Structure formats: structure tokens, C-alpha cells
Symmetry: C3
Subunit: 67 residues, 3 copies
Amino acid sequence: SVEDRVTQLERISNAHSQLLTQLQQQLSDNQSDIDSLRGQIQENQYQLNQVVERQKQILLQIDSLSS
Amino acid sequence: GSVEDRVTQLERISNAHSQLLTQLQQQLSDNQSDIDSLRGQIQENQYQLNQVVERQKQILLQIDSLS
Amino acid sequence: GSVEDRVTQLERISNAHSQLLTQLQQQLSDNQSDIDSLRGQIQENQYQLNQVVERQKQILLQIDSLS
Ligand code: NA
């Protein structure tokens, strides 16, 4: 039963090896996924910045026009 | 020190690992879900932003006429 | 090999798995932390966009007074 118990451990060890390598691959792909999302959020923030800045100029242009 | 002590200890660690691996799979799934969700949220934000940029371009032509 | 060798080998693999497990836990926490930070940021970009939308409506009314 020590042999059967060692045999069971080698079996579970093999499954743990396979799963750990699968998880490593997924974790690294997800890190890459997140990089793409962060890049897009940044790009969008820059775009919102540009809109806001131009709104400030528009408001001032309206003030100039009003006189 | 007996082989029995050691397979005892290996069964203990193996079960710890089994538990940690489940926890890891559960939290990875959550994270991959969050990745998909944030992707959706970005896309909806980019679209609304596209529309604001375009409304500003329309505003800027009204201002030009008045200048 | 003997039960004794098989055990020694399981012990080397079990140690390897503990190390990898610790590393994958850390990379999953990193991905979670990144997600929660980006969630915060997109919410803030949406909050600003909403303000920009209402400002465009106010700009239109002001442009209207000018003609
Ligand atoms: Na505007």
C-alpha cells in the first residue's frame, strides 16, 4: 500500500505538472492582454485631453466673439 | 525519516498544492472574466468619445462661420 | 527504481511545484492589481466624458446667443 500510495502521488504529481504549465501560459497571455487594454485606456485619455483642451479654446473664442 | 513518514509528508504537501491550484484556477477565471469585461467597457467608452470628437468638429464649424 | 528512489524524485518535483506555485500566485496578483487599477482609470475617463457632453450642450446654447 506504500507502493500504491507512491503510485497515486506520481499520478497526482503529473497532473499538477501539466496544470502548472497551462496556468503559466495563460498568466503570461493575460499579462499581454492587459497591456493591450492599458494602452487603449491611455490612448483614449489622451484623446479626451485633446477634446477638453479644445473646449477651453472654444469657450474663450465665444467670450471674444461676445465682445 | 521512515519512507512512511516521507510519503505521509508528500501526501500532505500534495493536498496543499491541490487546494492552492483550485484557488488559483478560480482566481484566474475571475481575472480572465475581468479582462473581457474591461475590454467591453473600453469599447463603449471609445465609441462615446468618437461621437464627442465629431460633435466638437460640428461645433467648430459653427464657430468658424460666426468668426 | 526502488520505492526509496521514487520518493526522493517526488520530493524534488514537489519542491519544484511549491516554487512555481508561489511564482504563479504572484503573477496572478499582479494581473489582478493591474485590472483593478485600469477599472479605476476607465471609470474616471467616463466621468470626465460625461462632463464634456454636458459642456458641449452649454457651448451650443452660447453659440446660439451669438447668432
Ligand atoms: Na466641444
